[PDB]
Swiss-Prot record, chain A:
Family named by the database record: Belongs to the complex I subunit 3 family.
Reaction equations catalysed: a ubiquinone + NADH + 5 H(+)(in) = a ubiquinol + NAD(+) + 4 H(+)(out)
Protein name, UniProt field: NADH-ubiquinone oxidoreductase chain 3
Keyword Iron on entry: no
Gene: mt:ND3
Amino acid sequence: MFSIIFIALLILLITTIVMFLASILSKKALIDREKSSPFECGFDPKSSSRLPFSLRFFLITIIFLIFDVEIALILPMIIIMKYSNIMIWTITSIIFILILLIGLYHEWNQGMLNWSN
Amino acid sequence: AVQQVRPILSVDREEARKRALNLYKAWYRQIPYIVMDYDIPMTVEQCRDKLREEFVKHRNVTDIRVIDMLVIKGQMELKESVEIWKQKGHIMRYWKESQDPKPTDFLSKFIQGV
């Protein structure tokens, strides 16, 4: 691994050096009150502009986590399949996926993504 | 020399003041927000001072109808400043800081041309 670690450190150092170098290569200009404003198509930005956090994107990412963990559970099936007892490996894995489908199809009839808002 | 004519909003001079002073409330209450929202030099006291003079701009308005319209204009400009449709240039417009007060006494006029 540490061969990988050192290479990444080397790259990152070379990366920052390049961007550090470009920071000196690019000519400077006297700062301007307006040059450093948020871009709002050329009309003054409104109040703070911090978006509302009343929304669903956490909800989708929570679906991600559930399936992301479930993915973790099924990752090792590749290797153990040669070793594990076949009934248990067969049925056990099959019901994983089956429950996933039924969760999905039950959830389509729920249709939770088609929120009213 | 009187005419029997339609109204617009206000039926009596006192209702006119009632409407006119309502506007003065919105503008007084708004000023702090614009000082924050619009990144312009002006400060609260100056903005308040101008608001006073800018009502004094027309003190001797007399007709009920005319004063009604002046308020109609104000309610509009209030909303355009309340929400930020306007721009820092537009809001500062009330000060006219690009042009120096031109000469006024006769010699300065005379020595500086018509």
